[PDB]
Ligand binder design. Structure first.
Ligand SMILES: *C/C=C(C)/C=C/C=C(C)/C=C/C1=C(C)CCCC1(C)C
Ligand SMILES: *C/C=C(C)/C=C/C=C(C)/C=C/C1=C(C)CCCC1(C)C
Ligand SMILES: *C/C=C(C)/C=C/C=C(C)/C=C/C1=C(C)CCCC1(C)C
Ligand SMILES: CCCCCCCCO[C@@H]1O[C@H](CO)[C@@H](O)[C@H](O)[C@H]1O
Ligand SMILES: CCCCCCCCO[C@@H]1O[C@H](CO)[C@@H](O)[C@H](O)[C@H]1O
Ligand SMILES: CCCCCCCCO[C@@H]1O[C@H](CO)[C@@H](O)[C@H](O)[C@H]1O
Ligand SMILES: [Br-]
Ligand SMILES: [Br-]
Ligand SMILES: [Br-]
Ligand SMILES: [Br-]
Ligand SMILES: [Br-]
Ligand SMILES: [Br-]
Lengths: 243, 243, 243
């Protein structure tokens, strides 16, 4: 009745996003039929990858393929216990969050060099996050990895709010880029807060069911809604984008 | 005499392509001595990577490093048995099939955005294929992963047959691009057919020796012959390509 | 007193570079405050990633997350024994050595195609190196992987010394590119020599403490000093670089 409850929280939190990612793919495909080949069609292709990765990720977690048990180190609020870890999330972020950055980058028309470095910083953020969840030898190391990951995040954040906005202004998309940048910054901040507050971190919240739902809700906005806003603006502003 | 036979099928299927990939590298290097630095030399560099990855892949499988046993889930034609899985193949495809796409892309002179998205879809195809072979918890999940992988493949296929052909026409290479696109589409289709028909899939064919040979033969055409045709046309048409 | 000594060699060899990478990040950040946004700021962003990856790598090894024991195959100087392997190094190289190549590439203003192929060859070099250290089934295979890895290295080396220098000449940076290319070639050569001479290879040197220190010292020059020279020249030559 707490295990019954913890398991109902887990499975529902995964099944919903398998549904919602699936539906988003369908809708994004239907939307792409009335978009002119070119720079709009490039932004659309990049955008469609986002839920395709997300549904893969969630099939990963549902099947157990990318879920494991981790013994928490001495000093942890749950020291000496095996904790459920959805390390599949941290893994697939490393492919899905660069799809987001590619869409934005194409939208804001950035320098490929800036693009390559941001995406590199982003893959570093994701991988050191996974290192943090997997590290079992000491509490010191888990949070050192957390902090390195934050440093990467900052690199990604800086480029958005400076260079990429600058590129957006002279590409004619500064306004829509600024709507999306805000969503992205606000919502991406949710993830390290969830990690820290949740069971892998401080464990102020000890239900993995709850933390899993927290990530799932964040995915809904950061991926599917983000992607839907992008596509609606692009289909309405095709000339403002092409060439 | 069936184990003697299954093992002779396996080892020969791997050793041949170690030989053939090795020879292709030698020949491609010799061919590259009479190619002018520039766009031809870029296509050649990209093309040479193809067998270099392939020989690595096959050394992986021969040494056992990238081969494992997988228990098939309930409902599978071979439910409850350990099946030999050459998961090394699925792994290295994720680096070799983007080398192919890079060669084609350079040949057809595509938009880097289209390039980045195709390659991303391609890496998604390969990784979800591996997810499908590794999934053991249920039959449903194995084929859901198969289907997601097909969705990625379709993304890759669409870009070739539309955008990338369009780019080929105005880059002066539409004719050679169209020869290569056809080879690629026809032969890449062979891979999910082999998976489905073979032991990891439906198991209409239960010899892993046979399925391994089927992949090996597909590699011969999709990589080595593909790469040989590309290089012969490029060395004969260097002006039609440069700048 | 030999175990006491072997362990003091190991931990000091890792802790030093956690320190030094940490300090380099601080200094590189401080240096980047007086660099004009643009092509200089792109080179700086790429350069800063280098120690960020390196410190991650070393936190990986210190925590045990990326260290393992490997049984050496028959015919090895240490056949039948478990050897300490810092496979974390081989792993993270695959992300850090492309940051180096990106910096150089941005500095020399190369063709993205050459860039993509070099980086691909570089990731191949790193991954087949890891294959070599992990292979346990036979000595033949370990060195075949060593040799494939060398072939990749050669691809990377050729592009530097020909194409990328050519690009450097007409981008106005040939002189600084040539200083950096020399450092890179000389120092990157150190790594397969250390592997071969050390315990994973021939085992002319059987202390993993010693080989670990050898890699650590190579990182100091190939990453931190390399990166420091790059940044000092860029801050002094911003007009020679921009646009
Ligand atoms: C669709 C998935 C998204 C938008 C995920 C974003 C994830 C992050 C921004 C993760 C951030 C983390 C840190 C910044 C610190 C360490 C832990 C992480 C990985 C949760
Ligand atoms: C050199 C290697 C090549 C050309 C491999 C190509 C592999 C594919 C096109 C794989 C396709 C698959 C699907 C489309 C569905 C699921 C199973 C796979 C990975 C076999
Ligand atoms: C910062 C890390 C650097 C600069 C590492 C460079 C590593 C190499 C150049 C590795 C080379 C190897 C070979 C060329 C052969 C096989 C073994 C390796 C991976 C050590
Ligand atoms: C979000 C920033 C946190 C960084 C410092 C982490 C604090 C050290 O670690 C934390 O210590 C807590 C109190 O002992 C425990 O409750 C947590 O489980 C543990 O992770
Ligand atoms: C190629 C498209 C196939 C998708 C549906 C797969 C069918 C469900 O799965 C299949 O069921 C078969 C019959 O029970 C078994 O023989 C197979 O081993 C099993 O994989
Ligand atoms: C650096 C180039 C070396 C390639 C050939 C490796 C030699 C075969 O392998 C080596 O044989 C040696 C002598 O038996 C042993 O001491 C080593 O441990 C073993 O790795
Ligand atoms: Br779960
Ligand atoms: Br994801
Ligand atoms: Br095999
Ligand atoms: Br391959
Ligand atoms: Br160690
Ligand atoms: Br590193």
């Amino acid at each position: 009745a707490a295990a019954v409850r913890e398991n109902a929280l887990l499975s529902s939190s995964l099944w919903v996003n398998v549904a919602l990612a699936g539906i988003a793919i369908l809708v994004f495909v239907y939307m792409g039929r009335t978009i002119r080949p070119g720079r709009p069609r490039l932004i659309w292709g990049a955008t469609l990858m986002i839920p395709l990765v997300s549904i893969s990720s969630y099939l990963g977690l549902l099947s157990g393929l990318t879920v494991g048990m981790i013994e928490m180190p001495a000093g942890h609020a749950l020291a000496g216990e095996m904790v459920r870890s959805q390390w599949g999330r941290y893994l697939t972020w490393a492919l899905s969050t660069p799809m987001i950055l590619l869409a934005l980058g194409l939208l804001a028309d950035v320098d490929l060099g800036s693009l390559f470095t941001v995406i590199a910083a982003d893959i570093g953020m994701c991988v050191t996050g996974l290192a943090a969840a997997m590290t079992t030898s000491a509490l010191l190391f888990r949070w050192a990895f957390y902090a390195i990951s934050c440093a990467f995040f900052v690199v990604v954040l800086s480029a958005l709010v400076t260079d990429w906005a600058a590129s957006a202004s002279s590409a004619g998309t500064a306004e829509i880029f600024d709507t999306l940048r805000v969503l992205t910054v606000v919502l991406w901040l949710g993830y390290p807060i969830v990690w820290a507050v949740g069971v892998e971190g401080l464990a102020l919240v000890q239900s993995v069911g709850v933390t899993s739902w927290a990530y799932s809700v964040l995915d809904v906005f950061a991926k599917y809604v983000f992607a839907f806003i992008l596509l609606r603006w692009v289909a309405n502003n095709e000339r403002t984008v092409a060439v």
